[model samples]
Target: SNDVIRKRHYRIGLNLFNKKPEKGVQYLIERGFVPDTPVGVAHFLLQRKGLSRQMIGEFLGNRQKQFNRDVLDCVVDEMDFSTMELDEALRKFQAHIRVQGEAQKVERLIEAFSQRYCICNPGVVRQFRNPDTIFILAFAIILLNTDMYSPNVKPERKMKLEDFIKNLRGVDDGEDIPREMLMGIYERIRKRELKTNEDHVSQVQKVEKLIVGKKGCVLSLPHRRLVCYCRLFEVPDPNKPQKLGLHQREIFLFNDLLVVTKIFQKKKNSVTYSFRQSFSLYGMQVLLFENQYYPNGIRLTSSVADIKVLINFNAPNPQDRKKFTDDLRESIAEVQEMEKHRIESELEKQ
Candidate 1:
């Protein structure tokens, strides 16, 4: 095990890291160099005097199949100035390093990290707003666009998966590239040939209909409260007292606001609005106006103050009403803190 490990360092002349060449040879010889190991290797070449770099290099090649060519090359340029200048030139050298080299990896990490931004289809997609579905749809479309990513290195010419896999190996770390596994991939590549250019172009796109989810994307509605099934009563008259008639609706509450949708056939279906009425959990507030217990009447203020009592809900089930009251009460507290922070931030900007 020690014999193999030492050979790895000598094989590269320990050139991957700095000062490996100058780390000396007692450890190199004892920790050990291979039987064919060049004796005056990179480190040893540095210490000796009198002998020319040419002589040292010649001696180095004498005992090995492939000695550290990088080390020998350095001696070839032995007349160069300080390591500072050499390092300085290397800094410039990296600027010329080809795209097929380090710069490509550097670019890849930049793209991967910057992929933080997300896309979503506007507003309601199906019966309600599904941000996850919306976001994914938009993202998938873009990543799948050949014009954007899998560009034809030239038009009418599609790169085969086999070619892609072959080049992929060039970037892969040296590992056991099983022959049989690659043969299977080669077979798949043959099957893939059936796709037309356009199909190949957007190879990643696939139609998916979600099993009708609860609602669409609201990226910041970190909270939800399923208050009871009740009605959104209209505050018909502003000045006179009105016994608000309850409309059968499924009441959904969030961190900042609530949704009041009419129930049909006793099913909580996807007709997502009473749009003239209300919305998502931002710049909004919904507060309780009664005893925070079920079987008790409750009302909301300023919430229904403008465009007014557009919707209101009540519950017959004691547990339903209790949970709704508690959750709404909690969510209101959350948004109160949210609005407070907003004002403070706006002040800070000034």
Candidate 2:
């Protein structure tokens, strides 16, 4: 019967990876099949039998590399890796350590992983070095199979969060993954699951176009509309003294996140924008420097993620500062309200 056939197929799919997790992990690691994306990386970690993020950070970071253990702890704890690439991890780790310009030792670690996987073959090495794609696609295909073939999901409706996440239920240590990592991946998938009308999609794509030379960025998430744009100077922080002087940075304000980029000259007519960092505005705090001594500056301090920075308007005018601050406050308030409602509804369900 059709029902019997479906049940058998679903059972087979459930046990697709019948090998023991430890044995499977050893084969992958020995073959240098390291993950480069957040989704794949999460899966990779699970195969390591629920290795914690802190241990992974310790393995990848080094004091001699100037990548401090404390900074690594803060980053892995705070960064929502589901929406970010694994390479971005190394970059942010280096950037916050104030050694962005120097050679990052973590890059060497990434290279070694590739070199081992490639086995010193030039043809294979070249492809592997360029952000290996086949592995992540395979994982996605597995997820798709589980979504489609499993009778756990009804044919009358599309897959929901429960359907998708339930498929990953036994992936980590034969149990659910860490709550933090699960939420990160769920939010990322939820963002992609949204399908807005063409008008809004086009609008966000245009905004994405404004991003110069940036790849792996998708700005078309639901309710993630752009707020404003401002170019400001990052002066030295009074709280902590540093030798670096004034630095120019471009700020892109989104309803849900704050993106910062450093502008540097690339050519006579062209300038390149390098991504510095981004802060999720859910619990972020903004402080305006309205006093006489610091009339045009604003300080962004978010202790939840251990982030603190100060930036000021290019001009001495206080009005621009006020405008930027007001817009930021408005955006943060809107995001907080949405998050509160989401949590309230979630809590009510149980």
Candidate 3:
């Protein structure tokens, strides 16, 4: 009974405009046109009819401005005088009135916006229950939809549209949630909502907090084993010729810090290297250290006793240096594993 009732109600609401366009419009107005509820209502109507996102935006924009004008215009154009009946004109007007699919399209646009800008708090679960937030979120979604379906728009201009959305969202130090993070969460939510059976993983809460704390640094988690904060800088690469003065500032990790370390030789031909490290603990007794370097790679290391050990190394290049570092890190991992086991056994004996 419940399932049948739900489906029947859903079908009726979805086909409201098709059954009676005028009544449906009246229903929307009578419902108080609440901001948050309209989003879902508009979404439902657009999707049921297989309309595109841009078309929906256009319809809404036009409806807001010339609601009566356009509706009446359709009725006037379709009026039939031969039958001396206005019913025929009303019927044709109903058929001619189109509602474009903006909800699905807007959803995609918001997904893209979340990716490039931070619009929501990263990592935490998003609550779509808020009206103001949803309104702004919907506005962004509409803008993207409009840009996509509008044919006269140029490619470069479309990019600007994206930029404009970012600006409105106040991304990169703007007052609102970082646009990029919002986009990221939106994507996660959309995927879960669209694919009911898909088991989606939520963003890491602690990791997200660290990112926001670090002022929205680019976060990379490779192999699901480490999280790295990456930044770019220029430092001299010693391997290059002296006249060329090859320089590269690479990312490095030490403790809970991410630093752009310079790789260069100082006075009397001594090599100098520096990097920042970000810290986190995996086990109660084991703390993992990680950092990301710009251009490529994240290195993870662990420290115990008097010795600092490299536990994992990831680099973009396939050079001998990287290989050597990897091997060293692997060896250290073996030592750490043995040490962990020994400690566990001793604890068991107690």
Candidate 4:
């Protein structure tokens, strides 16, 4: 039901400007689109008519003078549509509209991430507004687009704040960000507040190992295991399940893997993997091996030995090696598609 409504909203918003700008503007206004002045109305109308901001500003003359007041007034007037008590109603409608755009953009990002990395996390997709997530995502894009034949490659290199900002110039900033909002995102990314730690690496390593060793094995780790274990443990008791069994753990792990895999594979090269050095009698490892691997040693190209070692480790069998390489290429294509979709979706939403 939610999906259907969302799809409907998406179609409406997408065609709002193209098929019915006047009607769309009228609907938006009645629903809460208000401009401060007649010029504001004109600006909104022109925007709806698909004029670029710069072009509209030129047509209006005095860009800064007209733009801010109109936007602020529009937002304020929209809020004026209903009383605070009725805010929920307004929010619901607004959220639906907002989500229509956000979802479209997010879907594109998901597609991009899927195409680039061969996997994407819905959690990560949900967190796209977060700067830390954005940084990690940018890092993923770089990796996806990286030249595999490069001499130096380093997967573990800590991404610096500046580097993240630099790379983000084209990817994130291409969106016509308001100066104030851009500054905020810039500050947040610069702060590296979302910087993941060793634990993320551990989690990724754990997932990677399972996939690498078992080939077809899905993620069956403690975090996922706990969810299922708790459910089973609750079966006999009102709320407290003192212990969980291995079978439950395995089942939960498998289910989680499936869900996460589906979400991740929606994108391309964006999935993280966990690895383990060896298998135990229990067939589980405590420490997750490296979650990242260098392809052709892009970051460590100076060291031919390192490059060779990594290639050998990742591609042991010739047939498997061919598959891995092929997958990587496909991953890049997927990532590009996702990026394109994300950009288009964002622009439309805006």
> Which of the numbered candidates is closest to the native, going by highest TM-score?
2
Worst 10 residues of 4 by lDDT: 225-234
By summed lDDT, which 10 consecutive residues of candidate 2 come out lowest? 10-19
Listed in order, each prediction's TM-score against the native is 0.33, 0.37, 0.21, 0.18
Name the weakest run of 10 consecutive residues (lDDT summed) in model 1: 199-208
Prediction 2 global C-alpha lDDT: 0.47
Off by over 4 Å in 3: 1-20, 23-131, 169-174, 182-350
Per-residue alpha-carbon lDDT of candidate 1 for residues 211-281, written as tens digits (9 for 90 to 100): 12335433121122232233444333333443434444455553345655543322354333332234544
Candidate 1: residue pairs that collide: 21-43, 129-216, 129-217, 130-216, 130-217, 131-216, 131-217, 232-312
- How does each model score on lDDT? 0.35, 0.47, 0.35, 0.31
Candidate 3 per-residue C-alpha lDDT over 216-240 given as tens digits, one digit per residue, 9 for 90 to 100: 4443321011223333322223122
Cα lDDT tens digits, model 2, 210-328, are: 56655356755533556687777665554443333357678878756788887755687665667776677877677766444444667876655466543433323677667777788
Write one digit per residue (lDDT tens) for candidate 4, span 1-350. Answer: 54643433333332342233343334345534444355556545333422222222222222244443343333333423222211222222222122112333333322322332222233433434443444344333333223221236564554543444455454443442233433444444334322112222244345554333344444333222111111111112212222333111111122112111111122455543222222111111111112233122111011212322111122223453344334333323333333343355666787
TM-score winner, 2 or 3: 2
Question: Can you tell me which runs of candidate 1 are displaced by over 4 Å?
Answer: 1-246, 264-277, 280-296, 303-310, 317-319, 346-350
Residue 88, candidate 2: alpha-carbon lDDT? 30
Ranking of models by TM-score: 2, 1, 3, 4
lDDT of candidate 4 at residue 30, scale 0 to 100: 52
lDDT of 1 at 244: 35
